[PDB]
């Protein structure tokens, strides 16, 4: 399909005064990978990330509509933005297309800017800004991942542990993909520090 | 002055001069009147012939709006020519949209607001016209209408447009109205005519009569004036 | 709440019109922590005619001049402009009420040290 | 869907089912299929659903603005009008049939005919609907010129219930009005 | 999708399941499907997702923008006008069916909104995949003016009949009662279906994955 | 129109604007009000007169809510308030529909006067007559600006507009302190809008709006009846 | 003083005033006219005098009392071309609400709508704005009647009582006087004094056959044009 055109996994997982985001490494026309090293993680500012899948012309179009919308937006105030109006930011610019929308589906992960708290959420290709507490999952090989996190989650996680499964949820859910794969990388955020980790994945 | 040369302006006491020129404007020029009888509207204008100057026939202000309407124009007669097709295409409008004839007090609000329009904006200028509608219909009699260069659109009974307009209507409310056959009242609008305008400025003038009511069906038509020629023989009967 | 405000304002009431002062000033040092329940301006005037009802009774300077010091004091340690600006205002009323020579023209040139500031 | 519109001496006589399908699922037991435009002229919609009851609100709000302006009870030719310049400039996107009818002033009781084309005529008797043609042989042997107003009440009633009988798209319960000079006279009956 | 709502003799009680699928995977175990007008009505919707969120949020500003111009009070016959003039105009492209209930001045009233733009005002209506279950439940076991508690044990036995009947609804029951006073909102007001407990340890020790490059960026 | 579009506000040959000058002359002449800001709250009073008393005082308001925490009085001319008071409201949807958020009060006067200076370069048209008290309690501190017929926002922690504003800048210069309740930034409101009334100060007399953080409250008058006893 | 145009076009002065909106107030005072409103419990009375100068002119085309929805009337001032204008305006925008919003106005909403258009009149400098008065009366649900005024500038305001027209100060003073002092107001207890302040002010005590009442009633929320018979009969039952 369109979607399966490039391939693509964005995986973000909430812990416990943490949260992670995953993607994985691969660029590619449909059998024939071209480069290793696609970034599909794109941060907008501290402490809250994006991710982005499907189409890798939307991933890249979006990203720097994105970036343009949010840089004035922190320059016409003081202040940087709270991670549910960026949710309504990208849900807007993505309803503006409805008739031919953008072939991409953004998973948000943060935390808040005045305190700790973990935020999570995926949009549709249209803008329905869905919320959850666990985990979300967005790309081509969605029901492998839903295969992990049902089975690997567990409410209050270190971010050693946290680190742990998001590491073999990945993992196992990729490699059985055909189109995606080629390495994994890892964005594990909190208070403190951000610790940004490239696991070892099988490179075919 | 100072402030009579837009209409967006207002005097320093509230009025607008634009529109008071345009008022005298239409005073000088010659006399036009308009009675109706109990079933139908007769129309009369004096119309000056200075030598020759033209046919017999000539830049007639009877004009013909629709096919129950009529017109008196008098004043500046190239803006009387631009209203007559206005009143046509707003007639029109009205039977497509709907299909029944235009009322008669539809069809005097519809201009008279773009009357009114001329007179906000330094762009355009007030029209220098004023004219009569005449109607009949079965269904709702005859009626008479009466617009100004301001747009104050009204009914009467008898009115009267030009130069001899308070020295006209003193005698046609002598007259009956309720009374009369319209048959009756065409040789009355003519006395009036011959009775007002000595020839001392204009010795030639022609007299052109237009009627609509009962007798013609609601259908407006200009009298038989070279048939019958009741009027200008009953006319000058009075020379004394 | 205010079933007790109206049913200690009737035995407030009652204190004044009877004629007595030992159980209506008892009254009037009861319901000093009372002062903050309700708003600091409109306290003031709840005073002010507390006040009035404790002195249009009797001529009976052995107190009167005494719950004034309480106020005064009480309002030294509470901190409210208004509220001290209205006790000193009957106090130099009272005063000339008893004719006095220095202590009231004392008292009167130092509220106009504050007052007109 | 099954509506009829007989006219007599003084006024008409309006009916019409109740049921709304959306293709074989009843979305609606019960529905109003006439509108009042004004205080003595309905119609009676069929056809889409969307549409009748987007153009019936636009009719009701030229009408309406025009009779005040004329300061006067319109004419039921007038509101036919108003339907066929819409139907025909939007024949292409409107699938909508309707039936106005309604006493006048000047004219008495009028009934008119606005088809799916955008046509206008005036009738006697009309009838339309998806289950209007099973009743065809029956208004035809039936109808006598000259009718009063209770037996074109029983005659618009035995009618529409031959109709919700046979056909599955028509059915629910039968809404009557009668329109005179004195008033509207609704009722809902069955049978 | 199983969205309901039904007019009882003060107030006016709606109802919905909370599942979002896309395609045949459940996407969210718990949505949020009862939506904000006003103070006095609320909406419910169905279909299309992300075309109710727009649309139901568009006009919530406008009435709120409407009745601060007022100063009196929303009507639903408002919000009903404003919702069909809308979307007939897209030409039914805007998947949108709606469910529209509030109390006036006049009293409750209780809309059912298609995407074309058809409306209709009925006692109780029923919109959704499950609608057809919803409303079996709704005929069989229904009388006017009903009472409160009559009223939510009814929407709450016709909800859980479109879960159990049908596969695009499987979760948590909510509810929203509108009197003429009182707006109760009761997100979870049933849960009948729990989730089955893990019976095996499936956490390995922490370093049991291999890492090629680390990086550690500290923040403020 | 036709076309013309031509700027009827240039500079004098000293460097001034003239006609915003002007305007500043009718803000001047108009109905006295007061804001005070107090460290929980802010306070909205302006003045409101009735020349008979053949007038009705439950129709035309003066304190107007914005969006359900940011009220708004003026100082100026009555009509040209309205305006502005429309294009406020349907300005804070703009920002609800996108941002799902309640809409800061900085923010709205940054979008305000670039409405009304915008409005004043442009041709045809001549300048508001109309000055601002906007208030709001966003995120836990609650706030106060100034708007005027040039476009330029301040942020005041008490001022006054209208008659005599400067005697009332004086009074609250004196009056106002580091901070105080909101009940005693009500007291100080109906002290400063007493010091150029006329004798009858009613609950009709004068409209009180104030910013709790629970949100924005219009005053009734009997609340106004009821903290006037003992005002000032 | 005048600075730069400040005469002529919607600009300001140095004083901080505008004049031709101040010269529009005294537009109204060339119609010549003076109309009355009284708010009571459970009516509202509109009475309006009318000039008939000449015996050829109908009883019929001149009254003031126009029609805006059935449950709205009104009454204009001012000049006559500028009346009609500003009632299509708001016969259009009546309608307007009914097919948005699918009730039917409030008369208070409709006032907001018209002096927001005046605003725009008086705010682009090219046109002219509109000097003409409006009051307004009708009946709102819990709420009862109402009586407003939009004014060329562009405000308004509720009344109890409240006249325009030419002679306001003279009648304001009594309806003061007539109001302060506390007494019923019924039904023809309101519309007997609406008769006799438009009496006394004038000074005329006329002919039943000038003057027309507007009344609307809670009980009949339809605007309602009084029959001369029964204008004349509330005249002989206030006479002793």
Known sequence: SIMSYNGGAVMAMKGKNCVAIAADRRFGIQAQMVTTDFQKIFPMGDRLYIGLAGLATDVQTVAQRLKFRLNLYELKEGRQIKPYTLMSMVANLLYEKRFGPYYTEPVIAGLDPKTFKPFICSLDLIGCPMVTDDFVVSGTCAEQMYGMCESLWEPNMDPDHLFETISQAMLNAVDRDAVSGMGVIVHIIEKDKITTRTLKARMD | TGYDLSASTFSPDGRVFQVEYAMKAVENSSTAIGIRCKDGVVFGVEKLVLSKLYEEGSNKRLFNVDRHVGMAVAGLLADARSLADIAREEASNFRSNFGYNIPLKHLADRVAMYVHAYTLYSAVRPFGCSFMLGSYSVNDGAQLYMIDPSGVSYGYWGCAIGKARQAAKTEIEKLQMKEMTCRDIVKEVAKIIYIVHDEVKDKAFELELSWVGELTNGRHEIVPKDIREEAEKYAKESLK | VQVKEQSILELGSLLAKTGQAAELGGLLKYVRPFLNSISKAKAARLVRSLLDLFLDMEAATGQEVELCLECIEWAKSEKRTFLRQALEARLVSLYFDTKRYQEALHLGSQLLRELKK | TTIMAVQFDGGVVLGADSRTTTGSYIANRVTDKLTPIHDRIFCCRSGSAADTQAVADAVTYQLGFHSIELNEPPLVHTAASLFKEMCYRYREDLMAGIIIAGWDPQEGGQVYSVPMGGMMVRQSFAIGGSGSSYIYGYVDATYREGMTKEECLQFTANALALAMERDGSSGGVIRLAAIAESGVERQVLLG | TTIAGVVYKDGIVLGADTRATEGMVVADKNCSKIHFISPNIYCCGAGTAADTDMTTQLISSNLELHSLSTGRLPRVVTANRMLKQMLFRYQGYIGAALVLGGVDVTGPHLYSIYPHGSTDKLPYVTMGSGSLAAMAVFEDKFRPDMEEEEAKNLVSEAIAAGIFNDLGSGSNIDLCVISKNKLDFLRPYTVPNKKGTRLGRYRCEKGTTAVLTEKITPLE | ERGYSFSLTTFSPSGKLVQIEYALAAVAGGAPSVGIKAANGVVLATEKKQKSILYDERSVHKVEPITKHIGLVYSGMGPDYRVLVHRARKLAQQYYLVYQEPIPTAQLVQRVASVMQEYTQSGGVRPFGVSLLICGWNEGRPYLFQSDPSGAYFAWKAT????????????????????????????????????????QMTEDNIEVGICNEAGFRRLTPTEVKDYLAAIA | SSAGFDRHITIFSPEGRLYQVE??????????????????????????????????????????????????????????????????????????????????????????????????????????????????????????????????????????????????????????????????????????????????????????????????????????????????????????
């Open chain 7, 23 to 240: 010269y529009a107030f005294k537009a109204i005072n060339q119609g010549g006219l003076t109309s009355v409103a009284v708010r009571g419990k459970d009516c509202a009375v509109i009475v309006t005098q009318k000039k008939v100068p000449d015996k050829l002119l109908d009883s019929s085309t001149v009254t003031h009392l126009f029609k805006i929805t059935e449950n709205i009337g009104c009454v204009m001032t001012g000049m006559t071309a500028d009346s009609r204008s500003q009632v299509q305006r708001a016969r259009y925008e009546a309608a307007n609400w009914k097919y948005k919003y699918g009730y039917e106005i409030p008369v208070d909403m409709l006032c907001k709508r018209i002096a927001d258009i005046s605003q725009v009149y008086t705010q682009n400098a090219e046109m002219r704005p509109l000097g003409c008065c409006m009051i307004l009366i009708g009946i709102d649900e819990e709420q009862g009647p109402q009586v407003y005024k939009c004014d060329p500038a562009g405000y308004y305001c509720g009344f109890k009582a409240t006249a325009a027209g030419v002679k306001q100060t003279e009648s304001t003073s009594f309806l003061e006087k007539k109001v302060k002092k506390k007494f019923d107001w019924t039904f023809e207890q309101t519309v007997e004094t609406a008769i006799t302040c438009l009496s006394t002010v004038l000074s005329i005590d006329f002919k039943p056959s000038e003057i027309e009442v507007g009344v609307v009633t809670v009980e009949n929320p339809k605007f309602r044009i009084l029959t001369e018979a029964e204008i004349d009969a509330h005249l002989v039952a206030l006479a002793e």
């Open chain 6, 160 to 199: 006054a507009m209208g008659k005599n504003y400067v005697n009332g800048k004086t009074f609250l210069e004196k009056r106002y302190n580091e901070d105080l309740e909101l009940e005693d930034a009500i007291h100080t409101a109906i002290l400063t809008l007493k010091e150029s009334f006329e004798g």
